[PDB]
Amino acid sequence: NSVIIAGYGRFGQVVGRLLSAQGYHLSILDHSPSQIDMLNKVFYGDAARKDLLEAAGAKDAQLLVIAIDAPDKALEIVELAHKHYPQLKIVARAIDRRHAYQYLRLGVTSFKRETFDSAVNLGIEALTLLGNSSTVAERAGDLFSQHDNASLHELAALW
């Protein structure tokens, strides 16, 4: 089936790869030409242009991934998606806590802060390196995550 990846930097390529593994066709949008694979559909331009999303089959796609590094444009897309393609589901890259609150305020709950999960994991590797069993090191990580994300939403919930 059909997925639109807006932004194809370090973030969007990982997601792109992950999903093609299960055999989802992709339509990629990115600033600036590189070189590119057949076997996908690629348009160069501002992802926050409606004409361009429509060309990536935004009309009939199932999911839109927002994987660009510019946080204002990212929100600008979320709105166009709502305004014009309400049948489109949206996952989104959030830069930091503040950006994540803004997604929440527009009712986007499926996002991920870009450096958070790697930082948590670096800190799990840290804890093991100080001689904590991987089970306790990883349990520490989970409880830390769960709460941080929980409490991030809780406060968002009181707009």
Q: Which is nearer to ligand AMP, 49 or 139 (CB)?
A: 49
Q: Which is nearer to a copy of itself, 51 or 89 (CB)?
A: 89
With CB under 5 to 8 Å by kind, the binding choice for 132 among ligand AMP, a copy of itself, none is a copy of itself
Smallest gap from residue 127 Cβ to ligand AMP (A): 19
Q: Which is nearer to ligand AMP, 12 or 58 (CB)?
A: 12
Residues that bind ligand AMP (CB under 6 A): 7-12, 29-32, 46-48, 67-70, 73
Smallest gap from residue 44 Cβ to ligand AMP (A): 8
46 is in an annotated binding site: yes
What DSSP string runs through the chain? -EEEEE--SHHHHHHHHHHHHHT-EEEEEESS--------EEEES-TT-HHHHHHTTTTT-SEEEE--S-HHHHHHHHHHHHHH-TT-EEEEEESSHHHHHHHHHTT---EEETTHHHHHHHHHHHHHHTT--HHHHHHHHHHHHHHHHHHHHHHHHT-
Smallest gap from residue 115 Cβ to ligand AMP (A): 6
The CA angle 155-156-158, to the nearest 5 degrees, is: 70
113 is in an annotated binding site: no
Q: What is the rounded radius of gyration, in angstroms, for the C-alpha atoms of the chain?
A: 18
With CB under 5 to 8 Å by kind, the binding choice for 121 among a copy of itself, ligand AMP, none is a copy of itself
Q: Which is nearer to a copy of itself, 130 or 157 (CB)?
A: 130
47 is in an annotated binding site: yes
